[PDB]
């Protein structure tokens, strides 16, 4: 199985023990580590942060002791902006100069492939996305020589039915990508006005869910139906939670909320808590397991957090193994307890190790 794990460059600016640099990563934890995110500057792939180049190094020296470790560079992200990625993908010259810039850039910094993270193509960029995917794999193939391993090409895709319908030509795109990370998380957010688990395994109770689509099981089965080979699907499992501020004394699923949850001390993002932040939240909170969604949530005071834990993670890996998926994608290593000191016990990366272990268990 593939265990594909993202690392995010911005996880270095968190205070104290929240600071995560690629050298804090276990070389043998994942089969693939993807660095997020690179820029596209003057139609060339290029650095995003300032220390990317030195951090690129930190990541790829991990392969020295685990040569089988594969690393990819992810292009795009949220702050890139669909418009700019569109302008590049739609223009025939911009694509070529971009496509031609990628292989030398990846090789100089020791990456094994590119991971496309257009978040998210438009309805008007669906063909442009297909031609970009096709032409990228085309050049990766042409560029290969004896002694140059062909570069990998993957993509992070939305798990939302609506965007999948508008933006992706799954059947055609599947044939060119080496694997697809399906972002089967963030299904529920504060804009809905209710509590809801953001990464449920199944729809669960028919009344509770707002729509039939915002769950991992539907997303996986949908892409399979749209022509993604199971052997190329990598199922997203989050190591973070969506938090809400309760608007009443109710703490159940579907309870009214006043907005996102109070920001975490390390992530400093409203509505997001890293797993190591959740362990602190769990002190004096009551934990409830959503029976039909097979994932936990916790409440303490006016805070409600739906998150994944070691059991819900195993259930998800069980589901993907039974589905004969390619494996699991973890978002993200820096949101797991990479320190191993936050969540109790002695061990680092408790969630992603649970995935690795469930993937390895027969």
């Amino acid at each position, epitope marked *: 199985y593939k265990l594909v794990c993202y690392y995010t460059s911005w996880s270095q600016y968190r205070e104290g023990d929240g600071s995560c640099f690629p050298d804090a990563l276990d070389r043998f934890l994942c089969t693939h580590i993807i660095y997020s995110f690179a820029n596209i500057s003057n139609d*060339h792939i290029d650095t995003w942060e300032w220390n990317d180049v030195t951090l690129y190094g930190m990541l790829n020296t991990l392969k020295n002791r685990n040569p089988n470790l594969k690393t990819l560079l992810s292009v795009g992200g949220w702050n890139f902006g669909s418009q700019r990625f569109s302008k590049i993908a739609s223009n025939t010259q911009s694509r070529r*100069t971009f496509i031609k810039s990628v292989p*030398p850039f990846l090789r*100089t910094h*020791g990456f094994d492939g590119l991971d496309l993270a257009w978040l998210y193509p438009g309805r008007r960029d669906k063909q442009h996305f297909t031609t970009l995917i096709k032409e990228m794999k085309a050049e990766f193939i042409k560029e290969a*020589q004896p*002694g140059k391993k062909q570069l990998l090409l993957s993509a992070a895709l939305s798990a939302g039915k609506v965007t999948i319908d508008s933006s992706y030509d799954i059947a055609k795109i599947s044939q060119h990508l080496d694997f697809i990370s399906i972002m089967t998380y963030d299904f529920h957010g504060a804009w809905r006005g209710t509590t809801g688990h953001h990464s449920p395994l199944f729809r669960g109770q028919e009344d509770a869910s707002p729509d039939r689509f915002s769950n991992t099981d539907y997303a996986v089965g949908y892409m399979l139906r749209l022509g993604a080979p199971a052997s190329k699907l990598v199922m997203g499992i989050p190591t973070f939670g969506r938090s809400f501020t309760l608007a009443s004394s109710e703490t159940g699923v579907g309870a009214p909320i006043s907005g996102p949850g109070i920001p975490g001390r390390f992530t400093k993002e409203a509505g997001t808590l890293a797993y190591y932040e959740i362990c602190d939240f769990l002190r004096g909170a009551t934990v409830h397991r959503i029976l039909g969604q097979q994932v936990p949530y916790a409440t303490k005071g006016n805070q409600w957090v739906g998150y994944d834990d070691q059991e819900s993670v195993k259930s998800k890996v069980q589901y993907l193994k039974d589905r004969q998926l390619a494996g699991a994608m973890v978002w993200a290593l820096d949101l797991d307890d990479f320190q191993g000191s936050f969540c109790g016990q002695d061990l680092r990366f408790p969630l992603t190790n649970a995935i690795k272990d469930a993937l390895a268990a027969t």
Partner: antibody
Amino acid sequence: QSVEESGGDLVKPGASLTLTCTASGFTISSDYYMCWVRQAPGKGLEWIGCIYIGSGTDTYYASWAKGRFTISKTSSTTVTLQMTSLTAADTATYFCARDKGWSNAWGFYFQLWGPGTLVTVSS
Amino acid sequence: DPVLTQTPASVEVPVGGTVTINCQASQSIGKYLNWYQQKPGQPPKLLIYSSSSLASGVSSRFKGSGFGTQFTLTISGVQCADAATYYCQQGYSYVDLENGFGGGTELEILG
């Protein structure tokens, strides 16, 4: 580590000629490329082609070579540049060079060069 | 096709001075640029492989720098025996190439 070219001669235009590059003490590694670079009198270096030694079946040629030039691995210690339909514009020194293989850190570079052999094309 | 143009065409430099040659590629070639020294009547000698690494037995007088499409060889403490033609070459691939080398730059050394 030695490379020496041979077979450079005077030839009539339209004729063809076969040059030979010979190796000496090559660290018994196959993963490398053997290439031919030509230099016309008083003009720059012009890459011709390469052959991958580990397979002896992968060949890469310059665009202008246009199939007149054929590189072949003939021994563990020899590769041959085979030139056809020669003209005055092919009058040049013909060098042989070698790679240390592909390296993500270092890349392709010609550390070994031969002294060259002269091909003079004249009636 | 990566196509390397080199400037200036020729340059005079006094003994013990410093020179800078410019080499630029029509496509990004990453860090894979090579520098060669060729004296009259001889094969080229590799000076710098990858953007800046020194070949065995080459002096630190030769410093390589640059990335992507523009590169630079800087010859320091210009020795009297440095008069030659200097070529740059892309070291990225052998596919769909016309010619990996540049036009070359000539050193005139002012003794």
